[PDB]
Amino acid sequence: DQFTIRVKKYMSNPLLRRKQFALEILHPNKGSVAKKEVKERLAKMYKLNNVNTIVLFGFKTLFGGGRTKGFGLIYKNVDAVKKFEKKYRLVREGLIDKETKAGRRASKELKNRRKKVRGT
Amino acid sequence: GSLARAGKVKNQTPKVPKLDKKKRLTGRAKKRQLYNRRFSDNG
Amino acid sequence: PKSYRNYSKTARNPKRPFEKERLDQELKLIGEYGLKNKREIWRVQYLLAKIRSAARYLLTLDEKSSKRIFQGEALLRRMVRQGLLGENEEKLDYVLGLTLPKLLERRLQTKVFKLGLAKSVHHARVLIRQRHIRVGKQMVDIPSFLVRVDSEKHIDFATTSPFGGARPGRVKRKSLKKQKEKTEA
Amino acid sequence: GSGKPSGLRAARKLRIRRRTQRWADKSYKKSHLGTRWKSNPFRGSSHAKGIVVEKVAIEAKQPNSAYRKCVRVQLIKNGKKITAFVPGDGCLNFIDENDEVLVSGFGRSGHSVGDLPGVKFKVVKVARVSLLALFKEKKEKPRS
RNA sequence: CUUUUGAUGUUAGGGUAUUGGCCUAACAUGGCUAUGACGGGUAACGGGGAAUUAGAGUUCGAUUCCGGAGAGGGAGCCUGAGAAAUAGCUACCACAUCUAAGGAAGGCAGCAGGCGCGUAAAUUACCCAAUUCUAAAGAAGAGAGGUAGUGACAAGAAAUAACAAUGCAAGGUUUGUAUUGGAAUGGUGGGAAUUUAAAACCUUCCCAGAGUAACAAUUGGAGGGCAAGUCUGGUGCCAGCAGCCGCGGUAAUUCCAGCUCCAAUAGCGUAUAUUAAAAUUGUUGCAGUUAAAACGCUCGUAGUUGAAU
Ligand SMILES: [Mg+2]
Ligand SMILES: [Mg+2]
Ligand SMILES: [Mg+2]
Ligand SMILES: [Mg+2]
Ligand SMILES: [Mg+2]
Ligand SMILES: [Mg+2]
Ligand SMILES: [Mg+2]
Ligand SMILES: [Mg+2]
Ligand SMILES: [Mg+2]
Ligand SMILES: [Mg+2]
Ligand SMILES: [Mg+2]
Ligand SMILES: [Mg+2]
Ligand SMILES: [Mg+2]
Ligand SMILES: [Mg+2]
Ligand SMILES: [Mg+2]
Ligand SMILES: [Mg+2]
Ligand SMILES: [Mg+2]
Ligand SMILES: [Mg+2]
Ligand SMILES: [Mg+2]
Ligand SMILES: [Mg+2]
Ligand SMILES: [Mg+2]
Ligand SMILES: [Mg+2]
Ligand SMILES: [Mg+2]
Ligand SMILES: [Mg+2]
Structure with missing residues (x-):
């Protein structure tokens, strides 16, 4: 709970619908803070009614504990996030999941197409 | 001639096994010890 | 393809491997400044040596040649930062006059030994490796670390050490405490 | 001038x-x-693999008096017959009369070494076990 | 040497996307060469570079980029803006697969993987997340590419204790070193936090968690060169070692051991090559009475060198 987030090279970006930033979490002594808490803090900071326009990533915890760098992304609305975030990040967040086993026996299947009028 | 003698002397010698020793120091510690032996108290 | 992450040898070997005097000198150095190999010494020599070479090159050029003034000046500044020269001896002829002691002095372990903290050099080294010591915010567990004069004053036991205020937090002390508790109950 | x-x-x-x-x-x-x-024989190489053809003795240069234990081997690479001295106090018998030996130079490029007359080669592996290892014995034992 | 077979040129053409003996015809007799032509060799792709050098240099450069070339071997085409394409086609040669014997398809010097060759080299892994390309161009593909796996190729950092008591030691009270004993901590094991396309590592925190801290450092040496034993047994010109000189013929400081020591140390040996050491290829920078080396002598073309003004 004794952890300040200082937010660096913050950058509004209306080409996308997001605020980018780098993000340092000072948490002296009591090491490591989970993403959820950080997100909450961010929300508190920027009024930001709903928590899940925030996407955090790249949280490296640095040698010795105590500090911890990351990258914050904050979208305008969930629609925006849906539109231009890559799927993996969305999945991680928990907005969606397709657990689709396309695999790369997909590739094999594709190359097994020689003459098509094939459902099969 | 004789390839019969190949491995004479070694075979002859009595096998005295190693023995227990005080596990030696290594790296820095060893260096320190060496220094002490050479220069510090003897100097 | 190959990666482009280029890499470099930090230490040249001797040349004449069983010269007595040199060996003795190396040993002395090791003794004094708590070093693990001759490799450390070699590394530091290399570090020194590059600088020395640069200085020599600069001196071959005349004053108010652009290169000499710029690069030489930069070198001097770097040396000053490192804690090799200071106030009196900042003229580029002086950066030649550096020896190994000058460099070893600025190793973190040596600094630690100097500024109280540990009874010995060896002790200091072990402290450093055992995650105590910090050099301005950041912990540091490599004794080699060349402390710059900007961050000499900001050296002490880290925030998270047992003897920098963050619980006995050991296998030892904690265990002892537990034992005591058990005995009590 | x-x-x-x-x-x-x-x-x-x-x-x-x-x-x-x-x-x-x-x-x-x-x-x-x-x-x-x-x-x-090695054809510009560090070592070569040769099956053995003959365990053989070679009498040393005049001042010294020994019969040095060599192995006349045939390189698989080249079909070349060469004597290779075998080190060790009793390491002729550690090899078989037909064993796939891995033979190196002796230390002096081509030029011959020491007491030996014209043996320019040092067997240093037999059936993939290291001759040195076998000599030490604490390390290894010849598999066959 | 090149020239019937275009060698060198001129003319006219043909051809090309265009120039051109590029090809044809006609006509000249040229062209290159001791400043090495033409052959031969290269264990030769070129270059950016690499190693090693005080400075010169010497060697290397298959190999991150640029260029060239090739897709078993030659040759030939089609398509197309671009191919003389090879996961296009035709043919032959050389390999080789299926076949009901009629035919048919095939080309890893793409990625893995296998046999062979060999001194000599990793997984038939996961993914398009990043970097890019292609497309009817966010949204699909990509063994391009990336991520892990194997990995002592190299490269970097760095544990294997530290500290304090007495006991013992030596020094002009302090350093050093045998008993104890509380502190420190990685490693290792398990959870998370994070990381990531998903994992794994990294780091991070929390539980576990050293005293013979068995969580056990090796490698190669101890005559000299060369740091370190004329310590103990064994062998007895044998076995062996020894890069070199040498050691061994019953005191071996050299063999075989044990102990002790020394070096470098998570590395350390051996081999082959290479650079330096090599002013032992000498431009800097060698030597030539006698050590290797002044042509028997002079003339002489190229070559190099050339008074002053
Ligand atoms: Mg800790
Ligand atoms: Mg004609
Ligand atoms: Mg070639
Ligand atoms: Mg190349
Ligand atoms: Mg080749
Ligand atoms: Mg092939
Ligand atoms: Mg083709
Ligand atoms: Mg192919
Ligand atoms: Mg073909
Ligand atoms: Mg392959
Ligand atoms: Mg290999
Ligand atoms: Mg992409
Ligand atoms: Mg690839
Ligand atoms: Mg000596
Ligand atoms: Mg040897
Ligand atoms: Mg004796
Ligand atoms: Mg011995
Ligand atoms: Mg040389
Ligand atoms: Mg020289
Ligand atoms: Mg000479
Ligand atoms: Mg003469
Ligand atoms: Mg004469
Ligand atoms: Mg003339
Ligand atoms: Mg003149």
């Missing part, structure tokens, strides 16, 4: 003489003649 020309425009002569003369240097000749690849 110097011997050499020291003209400003002399370079051709200077180069050319050096080019011809280099070949008097023995080492240079050894490096740059093509007979290296032809007339060498």
Whole structure:
């Protein structure tokens, strides 16, 4: 709970619908803070009614504990996030999941197409 | 001639096994010890 | 393809491997400044040596040649930062006059030994490796670390050490405490 | 006078003489003649694998008196027969009369070494176990 | 040497996307060469570079980029803006697969993987997340590419204790070193936090968690060169070692051991090559009475060198 987030090279970006930033979490002594808490803090900071326009990533915890760098992304609305975030990040967040086993026996299947009028 | 003698002397010698020793120091510690032996108290 | 992450040898070997005097000198150095190999010494020599070479090159050029003034000046500044020269001896002829002691002095372990903290050099080294010591915010567990004069004053036991205020937090002390508790109950 | 020309425009002569003369240097000749690849068992290599043909003794140079234990082996690479001295106090018997030996140089490029007359090679592995290891014995035992 | 077979040129053409003996015809007799032509060799792709150098240099450069070339071997085409394409086609040669014997398809010097060759080299892994390309161009593909796996190729950092008591030691009270004993901590094991396309590592925190801290450092040496034993047994010109000189013929400081020591140390040996050491290829920078080496002598073309003004 004794952890300040200082937010660096913050950058509004209306080409996308997001605020980018780098993000340092000072948490002296009591090491490591989970993403959820950080997100909450961010929300508190920027009024930001709903928590899940925030996407955090790249949280490296640095040698010795105590500090911890990351990258914050904050979208305008969930629609925006849906539109231009890559799927993996969305999945991680928990907005969606397709657990689709396309695999790369997909590739094999594709190359097994020689003459098509094939459902099969 | 004789390839019969190949491995004479070694075979002859009595096998005295190693023995227990005080596990030696290594790296820095060893260096320190060496220094002490050479220069510090003897100097 | 190959990666482009280029890499470099930090230490040249001797040349004449069983010269007595040199060996003795190396040993002395090791003794004094708590070093693990001759490799450390070699590394530091290399570090020194590059600088020395640069200085020599600069001196071959005349004053108010652009290169000499710029690069030489930069070198001097770097040396000053490192804690090799200071106030009196900042003229580029002086950066030649550096020896190994000058460099070893600025190793973190040596600094630690100097500024109280540990009874010995060896002790200091072990402290450093055992995650105590910090050099301005950041912990540091490599004794080699060349402390710059900007961050000499900001050296002490880290925030998270047992003897920098963050619980006995050991296998030892904690265990002892537990034992005591058990005995009590 | 110097011997050499020291003209400003002399370079051709200077180069050319050096080019011809280099070949008097023995080492240079050894490096740059093509007979290296032809007339060498290892054929420009560190080691070679040879099956053994004959465990054999070689009497040493006159002052010293020993019969050094060699192994006449046939290189698989080249079909070349060569004697290779086997180290160790009793390491002739550690090899078989037909064993796939891995043989190295002796330390002096081609040139022969020490007491031995004209054995330029040091067997240093038998059936993939290291001769040195076998000699030590605490490390390994010959698999067959 | 090149020239019937275009060698060198001129003219006219043909051809090309265009120039051109590029090809044809006609006509000249040229062209290159001791400043090495033409052959031969290269264990030769070129270059950017690499190693090693005080400075010169010497060697290397298959190999991150640029260029060239090739897709078993030659040759030939089609398509197309671009191919003389090879996961296009035709043919032959050389390999080789299926076949009901009629035919048919095939080309890893793409990625893995296998046999062979060999001194000599990793997984038939996961993914398009990043970097890019292609497309009807966010949204699909990509063994391009990336991520892990194997990996002592190299490269970097860095544990294997430290500290304090007495006991013992030596020094002019302090350093050093045998008993104890509380502190420190990685490693290792398990959870998370994070990381990531998903994992794994990294780091991070929390539980576990050293005293013979068995969580056990090796490698190669101890005559010299060369740092370190004329310590103990064994062998007895044998076995062996020894890069070199040498050691061994019953005191071996050299063999075989044990102990002790020395070096470098998570590395350390051996081999082959290479650079330096090599002013032992000498431009800097060698030597030539006698050590290797002044042509028997002079003339002489190229070559190099050339008074002053
Ligand atoms: Mg800790
Ligand atoms: Mg004609
Ligand atoms: Mg070639
Ligand atoms: Mg190349
Ligand atoms: Mg080749
Ligand atoms: Mg092939
Ligand atoms: Mg083709
Ligand atoms: Mg293919
Ligand atoms: Mg073909
Ligand atoms: Mg392959
Ligand atoms: Mg290999
Ligand atoms: Mg992409
Ligand atoms: Mg690839
Ligand atoms: Mg000596
Ligand atoms: Mg040897
Ligand atoms: Mg004896
Ligand atoms: Mg011995
Ligand atoms: Mg050389
Ligand atoms: Mg030189
Ligand atoms: Mg000479
Ligand atoms: Mg003479
Ligand atoms: Mg004469
Ligand atoms: Mg003339
Ligand atoms: Mg003149």
